[PDB]
Amino acid sequence: NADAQFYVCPPPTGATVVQFEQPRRCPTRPEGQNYTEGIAVVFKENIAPYKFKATMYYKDVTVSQVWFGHRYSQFMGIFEDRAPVPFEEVIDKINAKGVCRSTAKYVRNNMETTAFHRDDHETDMELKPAKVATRTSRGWHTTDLKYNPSRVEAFHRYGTTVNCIVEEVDARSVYPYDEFVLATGDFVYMSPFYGYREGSHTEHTSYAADRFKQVDGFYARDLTTKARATSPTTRNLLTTPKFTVAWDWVPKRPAVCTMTKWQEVDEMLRAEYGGSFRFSSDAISTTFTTNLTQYSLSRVDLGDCIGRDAREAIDRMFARKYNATHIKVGQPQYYLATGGFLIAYQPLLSNTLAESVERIKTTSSIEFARLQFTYNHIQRHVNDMLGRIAVAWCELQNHELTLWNEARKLNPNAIASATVGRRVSARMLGDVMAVSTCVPVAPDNVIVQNSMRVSSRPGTCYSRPLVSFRYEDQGPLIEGQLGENNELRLTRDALEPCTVGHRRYFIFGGGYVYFEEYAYSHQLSRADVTTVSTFIDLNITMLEDHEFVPLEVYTRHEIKDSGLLDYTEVQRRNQLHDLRFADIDTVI
Amino acid sequence: NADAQFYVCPPPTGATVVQFEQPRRCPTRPEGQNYTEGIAVVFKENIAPYKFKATMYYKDVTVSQVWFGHRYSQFMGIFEDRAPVPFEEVIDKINAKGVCRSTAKYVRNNMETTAFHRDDHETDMELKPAKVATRTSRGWHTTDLKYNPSRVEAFHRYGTTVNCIVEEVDARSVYPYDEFVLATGDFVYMSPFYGYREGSHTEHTSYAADRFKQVDGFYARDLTTKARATSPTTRNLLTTPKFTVAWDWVPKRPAVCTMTKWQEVDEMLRAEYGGSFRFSSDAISTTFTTNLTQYSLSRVDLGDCIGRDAREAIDRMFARKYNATHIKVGQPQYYLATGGFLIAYQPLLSNTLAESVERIKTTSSIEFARLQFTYNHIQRHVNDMLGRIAVAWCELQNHELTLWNEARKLNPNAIASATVGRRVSARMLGDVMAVSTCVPVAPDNVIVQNSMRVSSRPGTCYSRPLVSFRYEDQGPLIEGQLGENNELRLTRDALEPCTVGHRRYFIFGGGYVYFEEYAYSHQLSRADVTTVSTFIDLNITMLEDHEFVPLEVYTRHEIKDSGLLDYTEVQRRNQLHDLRFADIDTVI
Amino acid sequence: NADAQFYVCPPPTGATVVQFEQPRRCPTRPEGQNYTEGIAVVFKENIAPYKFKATMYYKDVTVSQVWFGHRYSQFMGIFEDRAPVPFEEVIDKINAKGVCRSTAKYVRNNMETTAFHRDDHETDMELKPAKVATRTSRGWHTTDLKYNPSRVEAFHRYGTTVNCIVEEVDARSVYPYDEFVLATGDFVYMSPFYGYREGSHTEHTSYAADRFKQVDGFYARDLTTKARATSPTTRNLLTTPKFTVAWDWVPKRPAVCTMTKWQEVDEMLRAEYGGSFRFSSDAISTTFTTNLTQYSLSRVDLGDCIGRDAREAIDRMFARKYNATHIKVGQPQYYLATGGFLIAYQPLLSNTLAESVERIKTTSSIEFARLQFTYNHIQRHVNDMLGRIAVAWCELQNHELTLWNEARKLNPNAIASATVGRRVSARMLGDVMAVSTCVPVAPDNVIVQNSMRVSSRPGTCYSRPLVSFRYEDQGPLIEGQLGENNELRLTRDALEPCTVGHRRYFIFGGGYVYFEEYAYSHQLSRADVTTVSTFIDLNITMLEDHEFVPLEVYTRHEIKDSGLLDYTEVQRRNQLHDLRFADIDTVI
Ligand SMILES: *[C@@H]1O[C@H](CO)[C@@H](O[C@@H]2O[C@H](CO)[C@@H](O)[C@H](O)[C@H]2NC(C)=O)[C@H](O)[C@H]1NC(C)=O
Ligand SMILES: *[C@@H]1O[C@H](CO)[C@@H](O[C@@H]2O[C@H](CO)[C@@H](O)[C@H](O)[C@H]2NC(C)=O)[C@H](O)[C@H]1NC(C)=O
Ligand SMILES: *[C@@H]1O[C@H](CO)[C@@H](O[C@@H]2O[C@H](CO)[C@@H](O)[C@H](O)[C@H]2NC(C)=O)[C@H](O)[C@H]1NC(C)=O
Ligand SMILES: *[C@@H]1O[C@H](CO)[C@@H](O[C@@H]2O[C@H](CO)[C@@H](O)[C@H](O)[C@H]2NC(C)=O)[C@H](O)[C@H]1NC(C)=O
Ligand SMILES: *[C@@H]1O[C@H](CO)[C@@H](O[C@@H]2O[C@H](CO)[C@@H](O)[C@H](O)[C@H]2NC(C)=O)[C@H](O)[C@H]1NC(C)=O
Ligand SMILES: *[C@@H]1O[C@H](CO)[C@@H](O[C@@H]2O[C@H](CO)[C@@H](O)[C@H](O)[C@H]2NC(C)=O)[C@H](O)[C@H]1NC(C)=O
Ligand SMILES: *[C@@H]1O[C@H](CO)[C@@H](O[C@@H]2O[C@H](CO)[C@@H](O)[C@H](O)[C@H]2NC(C)=O)[C@H](O)[C@H]1NC(C)=O
Ligand SMILES: *[C@@H]1O[C@H](CO)[C@@H](O[C@@H]2O[C@H](CO)[C@@H](O)[C@H](O)[C@H]2NC(C)=O)[C@H](O)[C@H]1NC(C)=O
Ligand SMILES: *[C@@H]1O[C@H](CO)[C@@H](O[C@@H]2O[C@H](CO)[C@@H](O)[C@H](O)[C@H]2NC(C)=O)[C@H](O)[C@H]1NC(C)=O
């Protein structure tokens, strides 16, 4: 007790008047974003090589030189070479009959060299299947054993082997498609699209004209089944210095593409704001950003697959999910998104609402677009809910003004003190409130009287306790009456008829003063009285800090290590052989 | 002023009565998600090859042919070959004594060829350490110098070199482990697990039976220290056409695994909703999703490491962090998560409680699971806090009704107008409120009288100003009295005794009208009076838009370029040699 | 109707008194995080090889052996070798005059071998440009055609070719830079920084001293234009067993670096909390975390580029964006961030406020730092807005107390019931409220009287309906008067003068009871009366669940397959050749 201040308040006068702030104009809900519904196909930069089937035709020519010492034989040398099979032989012997000449006649080191199997006369040898090995393609050959000369004591002799080999191999080529490789690791410096017809003669070739041939209406004969193909092809044949390679010719534009279809999105919402389109997919949790102008497909080099694949996928998705409820609005539109993604977009409309060239470079990481989706999804919800709270809060403040301007007529002192921000006396001057600042009085300078009975006129009593006080620690003593909430009135006018059973508690300092039968009893602290709350609880807690550690499924070291052989390490090791096991400096 | 409407309101009648909406049932704080506490071990698809130590044994056989011209010597040819060391020599000469025969006797090109070092008689040569090189493994050899024939003017002569080489090399194999490679780049077309015992003879082998040998109880002798191993091994030996390779045989199942332990999580919470489990780790900020049914380990090909590694890690983590406060509930459980992660989970409980085969394919990106964790963490907090606000808001609206139904008794006109949404007169008909719509009056049609004194009975005055007005711009003039907030009463009945010091402000149009001693003074604008606010401020602001740009630490081009040599570029360049520096077409 | 409890309320007494909870201390808006403004440069671990230009000098020596059979010629062998060009020839013939000797004299297999082009006398041959090929570097050679011996029936003859070749090639080297590779796939076991001067003789070399030479003041002569360089260089020349290689010598430290500049951030904010710095960039949406202590650059092996690049970029960004408005505070600071990113940071200040060695390992994924930025950005906004709502809510609850303690004087029964939480009678005992629990009465035990007229004194009427009731289903019948909200009073004291037009509705059970001219009319349900709401609506909805699926632009299989040739697949296929097309076991 005796900690809270007391106050004496003079009667207010028109010298200072106040009014309550009138209702504020409440904010409006921000208008919801307009989304165009649509179907989309997202394309990425093509990194995969163009793949096709090819067939190699060559003869393994081997010339061994043997020395016949006493009771032992020794190879003095083994010359190994690959000779190309001529076109006449590929067409008239291999494809027509499944045989090869037992001789190899070809140009090597600027000389026309000729080899004969076993050094015998030329004969047509039957091609037969190679021994099976796992994961390899088909192959055929004419000979299993190497031929070596027969013994002649103390002589050096030579023996020739000629094995005609045929192999089906996968061929690979990368943009700009001016050369290709075979599964054997052999390069071919000619475009896989090179030919005579349809302007294909302008494609790249590093070889002389006579090294190339194109056969129209060619029918392949299978070497194992001996069956002839049902339909013809345009067969390309190229004779390199080491082998002849054949493959089916096809037009370039419909075969290759610098873009690859990546995602088919049947629910792609398009929004427009800030001079850009936002294409968001709820299924893949991704948001792409683009300029408002379409990207002309004429800018894409070899982009013919884009329109073709987009139209097929869009029509398929539309038929599967929308044919019964929506319509297509115009033809597909193309947009280039940040990160190098090309989006083919088909806008839709519900039935109920129907009244020079370059290459795009795609990033390897989509995470920026998934963070964009996630941030936008959360931001939109938080801004919506906080916007609703801001509106409701303003409406509540305006609505309660009706209670405040009614309460002020009942107790202007309390309402003025609560709104002005300091203890004041107040009085209504019609429709405005006059105010005056109250003077504080220390709790030590007040004394309550022991009785509320009016001795001067029995049967009448004071409504509130009589009090005695002084403005300063030393000075005159003033007689007054206790008012509401530590108020000290300069007049003893609050009177009532005395009634039996009188019990009262009045606020006195930081506690209460109890009275019975118009006589003092004792002081109390607020803790002595039962407390009930007019407050509605709201337990809001902050979202705690969180630390994201670095995390990878496979480190780049594990990715480098997953390869069975590392060309760099094999070469480093093999080239150290002479430095480890020989002497590169001593001369004899 | 004249910038606001006036109103005349007829006395209400029981024709229209209203009541206040009774307290609404407030929403309940939703029940929190139940979490099982547990320890987890997350496994990913294994991409690393199986690694083991092997030893190669071969002889570098070299036959040089030299021409001895006048005052100069010239190599006419240098034949180089690698011959395998026979099993008898690997066991009885190399491993037993650290020596090799100075001869090489082997099969090449279907012939039994024999070579002698320096063309001398056979002798046992001592193996000695190879010259040191950085980053390479150990190696031994018998000879440093190449042997070339001695000069004989105008003759072609031959000279043989045989260098026995032994090398320790790293071997690698990938699933299904049917072949392996050596650090030299050489392939071995046999499973590293092939053998005779324990059903290992069913493993793959491309070689004839006599090319393989298995020595039980083999003791390796170190070629440098000459020390014999303390414990024996089962030694596999395979003679290929180019070299003999040896390695220790081990059972397949305990050696390889198609899954790899990736993360050990000591605090993995498991929630269940929507027919799926959500495994979340606060430490790695990741949430995995799975079906409710366990994944049977019997489905995993070669998955024996999963149970073994999971049990070891779970027990280790439990001992370190939980032995004093929790218990294990049942045996470890296995669940396959979206993205191809296999989770081994051990449920825990506080001490205070309980009274054909496949290959899993793992994604290289964990970001979907980290976005899932982040979104769930934010969503859960926002839904909790907004849920608490929704509850408190409803509780407050219900609580406030007690003040509203008390305020309506004091001023039914203002309270009815504030709740009905339009200006009306009102009256309490017991426990309901009768209402009637007020007719507007333009401010131009009203005139206030200059005095509030009652001339007919001095000493009495009007409580509020007398007013004169008309309903229409031209029509009869009606005499009345000013009511509250621009109300116009049709009766001059509000009276009081006249008192000295009378000062009053009354609402008049968009401002006030001041009076002194019951006589008019002047009009005022609301801006002329001091304003105090009954409103509690709340400054909510929207979360701004944010653009995420693409960002990579290393682009795939930088990753590709990080390799020292590129096999494709080296081959492309080397195969162009004849097209650049020679003539592949001219014939002489 | 007759579906809600009635209550008999006894007069309260001082046996139980209550007070309202006094205003709570409202929470404070937490102090905002302080941010130091600055410019930053982020460095990552360097993965790119050191690249430099080199020139190879070698002679392609070819010795063919031809057999001249009747009407055909055949190669018996073709020995091919690469011989290094001596220093005297590179300097005095090639660089001085653009010619090579037509002979090759070099050491091979411990013998000094000499070859003569066409077996003719030595002559100086002119180097001329090689035939053009796409994507290859420059090259020169002396000879186009291979030389083969002329026909001599039934003889074996030998022919020598010597083609001097010069090629400009790209050289690559990786840390620790102790060796390098050429574009041809050839390794050089010497540091590219090796030399004599400036302590460079301490660098690695696997070659003998006489195999290396360094020419100071060397002037390169272009082989095509014949023009001599304007400025000299220090030329390194190394003769390996297969070729001579030359390159310009440069000091190591300024040429290589173990770190690479990755991002230049002109707006990097640095915050400090929890004993760590947080460097956030709004432009790249990334937050890096570091310890408070700077990372000493002296710890970085070969880190000289870090200081140089940081100072250049910081000064450039400052000049472009800050020179007119800020100042630099001290020299650049270096901090190592989680994930292995080294941050060079330059603190700034606005003009208005101016009064052994290691190698850092960088993660390939930045996503943890982008999640960190995103989470922090959302968390900070949500905590700010919810913090403001918590403050405003408390301020509102405290402000409303002024209305509550005024309403209790008007209707203590209703206000006590609303705050205590159960139906009670109440009375003000001065400044505290006395309370007493009301006893319930079932609606079935209540009967209303048909008239409100006081028969004993005409002209006077009861203010509220007269009622009859019993406490139990069987017992004495008590006469009383209807109070507020289903209260039953034990005294018929509420009286008024009877007036014309009397109409009233009183709460009776879950409905109302209507009266006219002081006589009963009928009962009504609440639904029969027009309802108006005192509640402010707030429609909060939960943020729905969302599932993030795995998503990748390119799978690791597509990345692996993007390479044109795969060394592992080519070797696997080529080493199977004999197992497929030959017989490795048969002996003849
Ligand atoms: C979102 O789309 C709606 C139509 O669905 C647009 O609303 C129309 O706006 C104009 C201009 O104010 C009015 O004349 C129409 O009467 C509105 N139509 C309807 C049905 O209300 C709106 O402008 C669009 N908003 C944005 C941000 O693009
Ligand atoms: C969207 O359009 C803007 C131009 O309005 C493009 O921005 C330019 O891009 C080029 C290439 O990077 C730069 O050379 C220019 O300096 C940029 N200008 C500006 C003002 O920033 C932007 O690349 C387009 N984006 C997409 C996805 O199409
Ligand atoms: C306000 O809400 C928080 C929860 O957000 C309450 O804190 C939890 O209290 C229990 C009981 O002591 C603890 O076991 C939990 O660990 C606490 N959780 C957190 C996240 O701190 C808090 O008690 C509530 N306060 C009030 C006054 O109701
Ligand atoms: C979450 O776990 C709690 C126990 O911690 C479950 O609560 C019990 O639920 C039953 C059925 O309604 C009641 O009989 C008990 O009285 C509850 N116990 C307590 C302590 O409240 C709850 O059912 C679980 N909920 C879910 C969704 O799993
Ligand atoms: C969880 O179980 C569901 C089946 O209830 C699995 O979904 C099926 O997966 C196959 C193979 O991808 C598809 O062909 C089916 O069309 C799917 N069915 C449905 C109804 O979607 C799902 O793969 C399982 N997930 C995990 C992580 O085990
Ligand atoms: C409401 O809060 C915002 C901050 O969220 C206050 O905005 C600042 O206003 C000043 C004055 O225009 C600017 O100098 C600051 O740059 C603003 N800060 C931000 C982050 O925008 C705003 O003043 C507050 N409004 C009220 C009425 O208090
Ligand atoms: C953040 O920076 C501000 C200055 O912009 C610091 O504010 C001072 O804080 C102390 C301690 O309460 C006060 O005595 C001063 O009066 C404040 N200065 C001003 C100009 O307001 C503050 O210390 C900093 N806080 C942190 C966490 O770094
Ligand atoms: C920041 O400083 C702390 C030490 O105060 C470093 O923490 C240690 O990191 C190493 C390597 O991971 C561990 O072997 C130690 O056990 C860690 N010590 C402790 C007490 O945890 C931390 O690596 C530093 N981080 C940065 C980015 O510099
Ligand atoms: C509260 O707000 C929600 C939106 O957050 C309203 O829900 C929409 O209601 C219409 C009509 O039923 C539907 O067509 C939409 O699909 C709903 N949207 C969502 C996101 O659910 C809801 O009607 C509002 N409730 C009240 C009482 O106004």
Numbering used by the authors:
A (entry chain A), B (entry chain C), C (entry chain B): 103 to 457, 488 to 720
Give sentences from the paper.
The best conserved among them, glycoprotein B (gB), is essential as it performs membrane fusion by undergoing extensive rearrangements from a prefusion to postfusion conformation. Here we report a prefusion-specific nanobody against gB that is neutralizing with cross-species activity. We determined full-length high-resolution cryo electron microscopy (cryo-EM) structures of gB in its prefusion and postfusion conformation and describe the nanobody epitope and mode of neutralization.
To support this hypothesis, and to show the cross-species activity, we co-expressed wild-type HSV-2 gB with the nanobody in stable transduced HEK293T cells. gB is a type I transmembrane protein, presenting the ectodomain at the N-terminal end to the extracellular space and hence during expression into the endoplasmic reticulum lumen. After particle picking and two-dimensional classification, several classes were produced with gB in the prefusion state, resembling our stabilized HSV-1 gB structure, in addition to classes showing the easily identifiable postfusion conformation in side and top views. We then determined the structures of the prefusion and postfusion conformations of HSV-2 gB to 2.85 Å and 2.26 Å resolution, respectively. The membrane-embedded regions including the MPR, the TMD and the intraviral C-terminal domain are not resolved in either of the two HSV-2 gB structures.
